[PDB]
């Protein structure tokens, strides 16, 4: 048997969750659609999972989009066996760096840097390379 | 009576072509018939037989008014 969950790959760039929901909403009703995305960057990975309320809608979508060509990408859609419920898929967005580690006093980190430089000199001496300062 | 076809011959793809037929130079060389036609048109233009397209445009621009 097959479940309502569907796995779709080879998604063209920019084919986000909203577009998938709008396109697949014609085939009955879709329970939920999720698209894989990277953590550091919000762009999708070109593959996601969508669930259908009824198995007939899922099979119809799979048949229609089995090898559909979409602007240079031939979409491949598979119907998972019975069960195999979709797992979590966070809606990752662009990550912007935030600076927090400047609380230490400058005087303390000065001595820390001096000690680190001395340790580095000792280490490079231990590695078989003779050097000073 | 009614049975599916069998690919006994088509099962294995043909790795090599059928006939060598060494390629002629014309395939790797610009067309000679086009050159002959161009030379014929040049001769016609020189003989005052074919009006060059630019000359036709110039004449028509004066005309129609």
């Amino acid at each position: 048997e097959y479940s309502g969950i569907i796995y779709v790959s080879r998604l063209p760039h920019g084919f986000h969750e909203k577009e998938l929901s709008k396109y697949f909403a014609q085939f009955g009703d879709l329970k939920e659609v999720r698209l894989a995305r990277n953590k550091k960057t919000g762009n999708s990975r070109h593959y996601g999972f969508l669930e259908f309320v009824n198995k007939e809608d899922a099979m119809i979508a799979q048949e229609s989009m089995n090898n559909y060509l979409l602007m240079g990408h031939l979409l491949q859609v598979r119907v998972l066996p019975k069960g195999a419920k979709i797992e979590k898929l966070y809606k990752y967005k662009k990550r912007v760096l935030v600076e927090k580690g400047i609380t230490k006093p400058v005087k303390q980190l000065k001595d820390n840097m001096k000690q680190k430089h001395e340790e580095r000199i000792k280490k490079l001496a231990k590695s078989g390379i003779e050097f000073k300062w | 009576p009614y049975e599916p076809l069998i690919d006994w011959f088509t099962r294995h793809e043909e790795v090599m072509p059928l006939t060598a037929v060494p390629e002629p130079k014309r395939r790797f060389v610009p067309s000679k018939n086009e050159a002959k036609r161009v030379m014929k048109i040049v001769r016609a233009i020189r003989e005052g037989r074919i009006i060059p397209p630019k000359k036709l445009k110039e004449m028509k621009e004066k005309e129609k008014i």
Partner: protein, 159 residues
């Protein structure tokens, strides 16, 4: 009913695949009589008063296409499904399969003729393509293979 070789046609490509194939083919329309004539006249005029690369066009002649096939030069072949002398095209699919050249069956010979400035073209094939469309050509070949050989793997069976 009809023998397995007959009814192999009419199992054409889907709407999207056929549309994409025709869109790709429309970028390589051979120059019509007027276009070639004007180009030749311009060349003559330039020569009168005083190095182009190989032109790219779709090969469509039945004899020319058949010659291109069996030499593995052709990459994609389009076959009309409404050829009145069916014997002229019955052997084309099997010959292409034996030679391994990707092939497809399209609806209507007039559609093939339109993209080659002809009333009716029995077949339309591509030999060489520009580097820009090479990736597109490979993608179309893969899509056609997936939609024809696997989807219609029984096209050569069940009379």
């Amino acid at each position: 009913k009809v023998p397995p070789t007959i009814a192999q046609f009419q199992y054409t490509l889907d709407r999207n695949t056929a549309a994409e194939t025709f869109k790709l083919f429309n970028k390589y329309r051979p120059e019509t009589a007027a276009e070639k004539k004007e180009r030749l006249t311009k060349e003559a005029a330039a020569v009168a008063e005083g190095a182009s690369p190989k032109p790219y066009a779709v090969k469509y002649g039945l004899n020319h296409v058949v010659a291109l096939i069996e030499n593995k030069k052709a990459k994609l072949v389009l076959i009309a499904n409404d050829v009145d002398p069916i014997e002229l095209v019955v052997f084309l699919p099997a010959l292409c399969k034996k030679m391994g050249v990707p092939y497809a069956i399209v609806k209507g010979k007039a559609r093939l003729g339109t993209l080659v400035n002809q009333k009716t073209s029995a077949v339309a094939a591509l030999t060489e393509v520009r580097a820009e469309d090479e990736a597109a050509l490979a993608k179309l070949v893969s899509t056609i293979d997936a939609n024809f050989a696997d989807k219609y793997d029984e096209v050569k069976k069940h009379w």
